[PDB]
Design a protein around this ligand. Structure first.
Ligand SMILES: NC(=O)c1ccc[n+]([C@@H]2O[C@H](COP(=O)([O-])OP(=O)(O)OC[C@H]3O[C@@H](n4cnc5c(N)ncnc54)[C@H](O)[C@@H]3O)[C@@H](O)[C@H]2O)c1
Ligand SMILES: *C(=O)CCCCCCCCCCCCC
Ligand SMILES: [Zn+2]
Lengths: 6, 293
């Protein structure tokens, strides 16, 4: 998984 | 094992202080974010007044960095503080290390205050990277550059370019869209097997996968949140389709919430633990030392 606002 | 048993005598700061004084509690993990460096002059995103978000995530997406890197280096000049002084919370994590209680600090922050406060590499999973080092983007070069050099270029207002190959030189942070460092996954693999207390400070727990780290603790690991707002509670809608924070229901058994400034909250915890004088002296001695040099 990659960085993400969530 | 995955069973829900209550280890705190009560769901309070004092409960957590007693628990930390006990034998069961040997191995602490801190999870931290921008809230622990707000009082060090570095704005977070989500705070209404002084938060970056409105004073927007494009400037931290890779695909936008990839195209236009100038706005981010311009922002970093803006927010590059005049001096690097860690906060009471940073030094609280220091005391933990020094008492051999700190297993790891997992941080979203890229500001290096954890290292300045004297957390070592071993102690630190910088999940979103850091400004401490910088590298060339050219895979054949990958020359490494320190923060002193990076600062000279950001303050010079020239886009940093590698002196060997003239590629863009990138501060070493994980932008949104990019994959986290490998050491994050492999540390989490091992650390959450053996954590006795989960301490969570100055984070909204909105950035994944870093936020999902709280659900990796064993189900009976206490979790203390020091923050201006509750965070990490399961959403009523996204939950509809686990291991979120429960401070309040009748099914609360191990999650505590102290709501206020981290600096006050950590100072409160330290006092319960009889570390207050030790904390005052450290912060004061370290800040004076920073002022001298
Ligand atoms: N210091 C930095 O490195 C920095 C600063 C801003 C944003 N970011 C990046 O953006 C994301 C932000 O995630 P985040 O959750 O850390 O920030 P956020 O703004 O998303 O969440 C901050 C949380 O801390 C609280 N808070 C702020 N100041 C506080 C204080 N003094 N005392 C107590 N609580 C306080 C806020 O109310 C909020 O709950 C991360 O990926 C991070 O890398 C980093
Ligand atoms: C992922 O979260 C991207 C991280 C960038 C957000 C923080 C902005 C950087 C501000 C710090 C300035 C320099 C500090 C050494
Ligand atoms: Zn290069």
């Amino acid at each position: 998984p990659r960085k993400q606002l969530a | 094992g995955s069973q829900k048993e209550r280890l705190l005598d009560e769901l309070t700061l004092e409960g957590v202080a007693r628990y930390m004084q006990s034998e069961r509690c040997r191995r602490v993990i801190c999870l931290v974010g921008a809230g622990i460096s707000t009082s060090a002059g570095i704005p977070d995103f989500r705070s209404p007044s002084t938060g970056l978000y409105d004073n927007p995530e494009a400037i931290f997406e890779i695909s936008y960095f990839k195209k236009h890197p100038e706005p981010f280096f311009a922002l970093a000049k803006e927010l590059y503080p005049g001096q690097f002084k860690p906060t009471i919370c940073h030094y609280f994590m220091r005391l933990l290390k020094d008492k051999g209680l700190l297993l790891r600090c997992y941080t979203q922050n890229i500001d290096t205050l954890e290292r300045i406060a004297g957390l070592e590499q071993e102690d630190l999973v910088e999940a979103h990277g850091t400004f401490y080092t910088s590298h060339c983007v050219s895979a054949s070069c990958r020359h490494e550059y320190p923060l002193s050099w990076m600062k000279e270029k950001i303050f010079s207002e020239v886009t940093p370019k590698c002196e060997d190959c003239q590629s863009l030189v990138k501060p070493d942070i994980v932008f949104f869209g990019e994959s986290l460092p490998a050491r994050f996954f492999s540390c989490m693999q091992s650390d959450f097997l053996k954590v006795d207390l989960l301490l969570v400070m100055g984070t909204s727990l909105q950035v994944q996968p870093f936020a999902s780290l709280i659900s990796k603790a064993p189900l009976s690991t206490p979790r203390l949140l020091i923050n201006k707002e509750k965070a990490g509670q399961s959403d009523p809608f996204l939950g509809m389709i686990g291991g979120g924070m429960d401070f309040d229901s009748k099914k609360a058994y191990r999650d505590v919430a102290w709501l206020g400034e981290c600096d006050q909250g950590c100072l409160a915890l330290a006092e319960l633990l009889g570390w207050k004088k030790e904390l005052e002296d450290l912060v004061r001695r370290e800040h004076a030392s920073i002022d001298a040099q």
